[PDB]
Amino acid sequence: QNEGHECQCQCGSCKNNEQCQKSCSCPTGCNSDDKCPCGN
């Protein structure tokens, strides 16, 4: 499915890969590379 959730993380590292967009494992707060726990 969208095995993560709606990522929407304002991190460039997120905001590029539609993989993480739906398959990201970060909290809503993740809008900073510093605090990007994303497995993509």
Curated annotation (Swiss-Prot):
Cu cation 1 binds at C7, C9, C24. Cu cation 8 binds at C26, C30, C36. One of its GO terms (biological process) is removal of superoxide radicals. Keywords: Copper, Isopeptide bond, Metal-binding, Metal-thiolate cluster, Ubl conjugation. Cu cation 2 binds at C7, C20. There is a cross-link at K22 (Glycyl lysine isopeptide (Lys-Gly) (interchain with G-Cter in ubiquitin)). Cu cation 3 binds at C9, C14, C26. Cu cation 4 binds at C11, C14, C36. Cu cation 7 binds at C24, C26, C38. Cu cation 5 binds at C11, C30. GO terms for molecular function: antioxidant activity; cadmium ion binding; copper ion binding; superoxide dismutase activity. Cu cation 6 binds at C14, C20, C38. GO terms for cellular component: cytosol; mitochondrial intermembrane space. Contains 1 metal-binding domain: 6 to 8 copper ions are chelated within a single copper-thiolate cluster and are coordinated via cysteinyl thiolate bridges to 10 cysteine ligands. 6 copper ions are trigonally coordinated, whereas the other 2 are only digonally coordinated. Belongs to the metallothionein superfamily. Type 12 family. There are 2 copies for copper thionein in yeast. The 2 identical copies CUP1-1 and CUP1-2 are arranged in tandem. Protects the cell against copper toxicity by tightly chelating copper ions. May also act as a depository for copper designated for the effective transfer into the apo forms of copper proteins. This is Copper metallothionein 1-1. It comes from Saccharomyces cerevisiae (strain ATCC 204508 / S288c). The lineage of its organism: Eukaryota, Fungi, Dikarya, Ascomycota, Saccharomycotina. The chain holds residues 9 to 48 of 61 of the full protein.
